Design a protein around this ligand. Structure first.
Ligand SMILES: [Zn+2]
Ligand SMILES: [Zn+2]
Ligand SMILES: [Zn+2]
Ligand SMILES: [Zn+2]
Ligand SMILES: [Zn+2]
Ligand SMILES: [Zn+2]
Ligand SMILES: [Zn+2]
Ligand SMILES: [Zn+2]
Lengths: 80, 80, 80, 80
């Protein structure tokens, strides 16, 4: 990523690895190591992502938000 | 939330997302992004929640406590 | 506990909650909230415990060690 | 290890414990407590490892990288 990866990776059902970074982004990476997508938040993502039963990704941010992100990298919602 | 969300979200059997915040609270949020309940502790909740077999939520706090909280947001117990 | 509980609780097959504390200890607590045992390490336990298939508890410490602890609270081993 | 173990251990299907350390290394340890292998990264490993369906280990580092490491301790890839 573009900064320290303090957060811990989660794995989806098709093998995708999700992890947050200090550069403010949540990363989605393919098992072959090429970027799937990146989602841009307002602060460092120290917390670790969780995957719901439909494949929604949830992760917290230093900008005071819990994000919900669809498997395709579009925002679902963010609770402040 | 009202501060940095350093802690990592847990997911219940009915889809509820649980996460602690720096504003001292444990949050319970519905998959549609509306607040279910919030439980108020004495310090920042950096640690990540765990869900037991009956659905009790456990999480630690900076106020020296491990909290046990019923699925409805009432305190079960807190060990100091 | 006796200090900030930064670490995140793990749950055993019989419901026991395990969490580390800043007071240097790994705690084992019963679902009713009474202390089962406490194991004493050389520094703050920020990391979160894992449970193996036989029920061994593993957790790291600030004293440079990964601890392995039997379900009864006796040390199995510690790798430095 | 050679420094604080802030990160939280993951367990493989054959019982191996994986944990990162502050001495910059990801450790693979056998249930009997003897070192299996150690993988050397460019900074402190605060984040916690995840295990994929083929047994690949993923963990982040302070050197800005997410590492993918084969079960035998050779690098698979690292995304920067
Ligand atoms: Zn850096
Ligand atoms: Zn920043
Ligand atoms: Zn803030
Ligand atoms: Zn405060
Ligand atoms: Zn204190
Ligand atoms: Zn101390
Ligand atoms: Zn040290
Ligand atoms: Zn260093």
């Amino acid at each position: 990523t573009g900064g320290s990866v303090h957060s811990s990776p989660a794995i989806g059902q098709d093998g995708t690895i999700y992890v947050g970074s200090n550069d403010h982004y949540l990363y989605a990476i393919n098992p072959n190591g090429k970027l799937k997508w990146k989602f841009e938040t307002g602060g460092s993502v120290h917390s670790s992502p969780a995957i719901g039963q439909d494949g929604t990704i949830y992760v917290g941010s230093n900008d005071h938000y819990l994000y919900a992100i669809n498997p395709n990298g579009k925002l679902k919602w963010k609770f402040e």
